[PDB]
Amino acid sequence: PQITLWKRPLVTIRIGGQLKEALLDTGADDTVLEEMNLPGKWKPKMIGGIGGFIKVRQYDQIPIEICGHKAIGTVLVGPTPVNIIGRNLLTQIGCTLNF
Amino acid sequence: PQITLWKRPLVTIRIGGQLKEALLDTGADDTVLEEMNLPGKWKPKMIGGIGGFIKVRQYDQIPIEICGHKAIGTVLVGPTPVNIIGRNLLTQIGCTLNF
Numbered sequence: 001p002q003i004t005l006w007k008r009p010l011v012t013i014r015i016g017g018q019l020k021e022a023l024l025d026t027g028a029d030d031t032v033l034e035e036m037n038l039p040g041k042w043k044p045k046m047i048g049g050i051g052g053f054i055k056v057r058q059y060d061q062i063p064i065e066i067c068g069h070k071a072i073g074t075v076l077v078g079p080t081p082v083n084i085i086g087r088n089l090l091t092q093i094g095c096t097l098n099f
Numbered sequence: 100p101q102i103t104l105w106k107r108p109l110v111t112i113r114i115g116g117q118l119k120e121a122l123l124d125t126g127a128d129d130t131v132l133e134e135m136n137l138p139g140k141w142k143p144k145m146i147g148g149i150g151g152f153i154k155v156r157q158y159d160q161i162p163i164e165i166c167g168h169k170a171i172g173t174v175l176v177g178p179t180p181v182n183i184i185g186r187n188l189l190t191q192i193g194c195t196l197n198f
């Protein structure tokens with residue numbers, strides 16, 4: 001789809017058979033999701049944002065289907081204010097900015 | 100133009116004879132610029148992201164040129180690491196997300 005920006009670019013994602021809303025976030029290097037359980041090994045990581053730095057858990061090679069488009073990659077889980085899809089997965093689903 | 104997201108979507112902006120690089124950020128409701136002493140009236144505001152909140156100063160009707168495209172609207176000025184062009188201005192320069 002083409003998505004205009006008069007509203008937040010919120011889409012439905014499927015991850016581990018669960019549906020969530022997440023924000024398509026071109027200003028985010030990394031995809032960060034709110035607290036949830038995912039299987040497999042994770043590694044402790046810290047990441048910065050506008051308000052300071054937070055601890056997250058890093059899960060690798062996680063399938064997410066984002067508004068119908070399949071990605072498999074890194075998902076950080078932690079105290080993000082909202083589920084964000086970052087450039088690491090936006091590139092996988094072919095997402096570009098156009099004007 | 101079309102901007103892929105392999106790297107951060109940085110572009111040159113102009114705000115009164117300051118040229119700065121800024122993120123075209125679909126995950127940002129509002130435009131947030133690094134500390135600068137803009138003329139005119141402003142109001143204090145708090146905005147939240149990863150790590151928590153920062154205090155910003157909200158200026159209205161500020162003309163900003165983004166990649167040669169004209170915009171004018173609200174800009175929030177405060178202690179951000181990066182200049183962020185938010186949805187309030189992205190719409191004015193005709194920016195969409197596509198995949």
Ligand SMILES: COc1ccc(S(=O)(=O)N(CC(C)C)C[C@@H](O)[C@H](Cc2ccccc2)NC(=O)[C@@H]2CN(c3cccc(C(C)=O)c3)C(=O)O2)cc1
Pocket residue numbers: 023025026027028029030048049050051081082084124126127128129130131146147148149180181183185
């Ligand atoms: C009301 O208007 C608002 C406008 C913008 C924000 S936001 O910036 O918190 N953020 C909102 C989002 C998290 C829901 C926009 C993101 O795109 C944000 C932009 C950004 C902020 C600070 C530094 C870089 C980018 N992105 C992020 O929070 C993360 C943080 N980040 C990053 C990467 C590397 C190093 C850093 C450092 C050193 O801070 C940050 C990154 O790539 O994405 C909040 C409110």
